[PDB]
Amino acid sequence: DPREVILCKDQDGKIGLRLKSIDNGIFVQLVQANSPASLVGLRFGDQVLQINGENCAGWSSDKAHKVLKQAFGEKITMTIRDRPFERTITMHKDSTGHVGFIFKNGKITSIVKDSSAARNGLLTEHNICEINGQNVIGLKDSQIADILSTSGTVVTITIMPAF
Template sequence: MAGDVEQLFMCLFTSCKSFSVKCFFKSFAHFLSGLSFLSQVLRILYSRVLSQMAVSGPSAGLVVAPVSGNSLGARRAEIKPGVREIHLCKDERGKTGLRLRAIDQGIFVQLVQANTPASLVGLRFGDQILQIDGRDCAGWSTDKAHRVMKKASAEKIVMVVRDRPFQRNITLHKDSMGHVGFVIKKGKVISVVKGSSAARNGLLTNHSVCEVNGQNVIGLKDKEVTEILATAGNVVTLTIIPTVIYEHMVKRLSPTLIHHTMDHSIPDI
């Protein structure tokens, strides 16, 4: 298009007798010629960039957040928004397998024992209990929450629950060596490897690992957690919580009790 306009102005230039007008037309023609050359250069560069992208594809080193929608682990670890209602009962001993703790004027799940009514209904460490049998839990003490649970019906306890508000999920990609790039000590992230998937996806130190692909690992030895990570597949979803909150939440629970009674089973979807 620029070339056609340039030819038109050159025709006007040759037919014009005024020197000043001829100078104008001549300058404008040079300007259009420059535009035409620039557009050709840009087209060449653009075509080369496209061809290079088609050959090389996206760099694996720049992957930030792996697509996790189809990951089984991500679905198991999902922290759903909103609230849900569950119906809990007691076993033949009158137990639910649930321990609660008051934090910041709220009531939270401190411990879910394996193979108990609490584990069967899908309660998890860190879930917030908003209501028990229609009664708001806000402002309750730990003792009051346990008293209410003790007096509740053995056949049906209605709870309104919010999924793990203090926790968040991070999905990581293993490198060619099978590493995701962080070090834990007593379940706490103490180091993140520079340039690793953990670093690129925002894993922070001073956070405790609660789950690996939805499987609770609280109370497990570091070696056990490492073994779970090693067999977790190439895409791994971690559920983490700030360690300062975690330590407050497990206060007065012995490590032995957590290790041997916490539900560490792989959850159903």
Template sequence: MALYPSLEDMKIDQLMKAQSEVQNSGRASLAPFGLSNNTPYPLTPSAPLIYETSQPAPNAPVYPSLGEYMGLELSHDVIAANMPEYLQAPSNTALVTRPNYAVEPVNKIGALVAPLSGQSEGLKKGFVTNGVREVILCKNAEGKIGLRVQHINSGIFVSLVTKDSPAAQVGLRFGDQILQINGSNVAGYTMDKVHDIFKKCPVNGISVVVRDRPFERTVTLHKDSAGKIGFSFKDGKIINLVLDSSAARNGVLTDHNLLEVNGQNVIGLKDKEITKIIAEGGNIITVTIIPSFIYQHMTKSMSSSLIKGSMDHSIPAF
């Protein structure tokens, strides 16, 4: 069964398949929905596909264990009460280009088909793993990595990634949990101890293992004729949805905070700045959101002046 990044992609793909089947059978006159042979889109487009990259091992959790994440009680009952939509975990996906929709199984899992969204740079840059990864850092000419952390309930979390820093260039983001530095576990360390470790690290080859922020969702949206995607927000928090809009159709939820727009970090930006990024982001917009329940817990111990003044808000190149 095919999977799609948006409802609009699914509908277009279904129409394209129906038209192709009719033409192949020699009964083009019976094409559904009144489509003619002069279809406005190619029958075999070369848009990128999105492939799932991992499959949970038997008896393994579908998403990371979060029972003690930053001091939150994230039991089944708490999630059901505050974030019921996250009882079903999202699949991990990655963007891979395949011509002519050559659907190939990856680890025996199906592919996402994107006839409309596949060419969107925002869809590529907004990709998140929801897993553990290793990055190799270095220091800049000033001997800095461009990273600040906070220790919260025995965990170490990224609270600031400065613009154009080595940390920004390898894709570290606000809210990532640092698990290891050069092979040493950092659970239980203080903020000062971790900063001291980074200061004493060599200039090159600094290995950092991180877990991506949990409970993120990336949603691909399509602007209407008025250039709208269908939700309003205040202080970065989604407060209203427009009936029958792309946001409503594709599962955007209120009481969620915007983290990224087309992969660009918007945490700490003013609403008018975020609105401008959306307006200039093209007809297809990918937003990364997180429940406000978790976002507020992540930010309450962090300096708002640092987030707003020094946070990396550059357009990602990866």
């Protein structure tokens, strides 16, 4: 179900968010570190249904940002549907320690033949959101590799189609 968040804007009217229009909805694209948006649990991929009670349907991202900037007062309310495109896939490292995918810039690009990723039907053109509860949005590929290397046999990832 959708949830309500309440945030206070800084002096510049900002809450630490960038938004994106996808399929006539509005989605969270960037959440700034230690911002009001971060504190209330907004994440890349969350859908914004309303801002201060007004429907976001069909708005451009420019419009959504303008609505936030012009909002009266300190507090902004948003109604949020949590990452509607998120899926979870659990894989097991093989005898060589590989789960079986190639990624670039946090996005899965190839599935290794007959790997655990293959068996589990992992898809390409999907962004990796978390690996074993560790958010990897924003992190460098070398950091994502390190998390994968350090992981135990069982590797659970949350992914979303790159839209």
